[PDB]
Amino acid sequence: QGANISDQWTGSELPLAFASDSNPSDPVSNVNDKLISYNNQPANRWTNWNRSNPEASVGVLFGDSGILSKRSVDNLSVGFHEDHGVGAPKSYVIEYYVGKTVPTAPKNPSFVGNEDHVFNDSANWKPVTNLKAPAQLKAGEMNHFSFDKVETYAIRIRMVKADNKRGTSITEVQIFAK
Ligand SMILES: [Ca+2]
């Protein structure tokens, strides 16, 4: 297993987690903070609990040595969390950035859908190929995904909440270099 290319580094803008939308007290920066919690002791998660869109995406914008970088990516791990109000999504798509425009760091990374940004244009994303995924997503553990290697500035997981929940929830994601 190679270097972790999603974790935050102190004093570095990148890698940066981003989301289309978030419950504000559950910012997406929680997903790459190296804290993993499946409960409220402490609560540590991104969610879109009680937000208006049942679909949201969470992703990582890569960096090398403090500045933007493409990386070669073939994996994603996601620790779903669940309580009465949130849980694993009922459906998802994992996507990678293909825009010709070099992405900027979002001004408000937990709420990318509320600003003009390349990430909001579906032409700038393609789905990963030959996905290997769990047969069912499970809260309470790191759920591992693998796919054909791509060279990209960003990947994201775009997810629709379960019908019996008020949102989707993630305590941590991890992406590794080869
Ligand atoms: Ca975390």
Numbering used by the authors: 1466 to 1643
Quote the study on this structure:
BgaA is specific for galactose β-1,4-linked to glucose or GlcNAc [lactose or N-acetyllactosamine (LacNAc) motifs, respectively] found in glycoconjugates. Through detailed structural and functional analyses the molecular basis for the catalytic specificity of BgaA is defined and this activity is demonstrated as critical for the ability of pneumococci to utilize complex N-linked glycans as a carbon source and protect the bacterium from opsonophagocytic killing. Further analyses also revealed the presence of non-catalytic CBMs within the C-terminal region of BgaA that mediate adherence to host cell surface LacNAc and/or lactose.
However, fold prediction using the Phyre2 server, which does not rely on amino acid sequence similarity, distinguished two regions (XII and XV) with a high probability of adopting the β-sandwich fold common to many CBMs found in CAZymes. The two predicted CBMs were recombinantly produced and the polypeptides screened for binding to all commonly occurring monosaccharides by UV difference spectroscopy; only D-galactose gave a signature UV difference spectrum consistent with sugar binding. Subsequently, this approach was expanded to the relevant galactose-containing sugars LacNAc, lactose, galactopyranosyl-β-1,3-N-acetyl-D-glucosamine (lacto-N-biose), and galactopyranosyl-β-1,3-N-acetyl-D-galactosamine [Thomsen-Freidenreich (TF) epitope] and binding was only observed to LacNAc and lactose. A single bound metal ion was modeled as Ca2+ on the basis of coordination geometry and B-factor analysis. The shallow LacNAc binding site sits at the apex of the β-fold opposite the N- and C-termini. Tryptophan 1514 lies directly beneath the glycoside bond and coplanar with the disaccharide thus providing CH-π interactions with both pyranose rings and a higher affinity for β-linked disaccharides than for galactose alone. This binding site architecture accommodates lactose and LacNAc, but would limit the recognition of other sugars terminating in β-linked galactose.
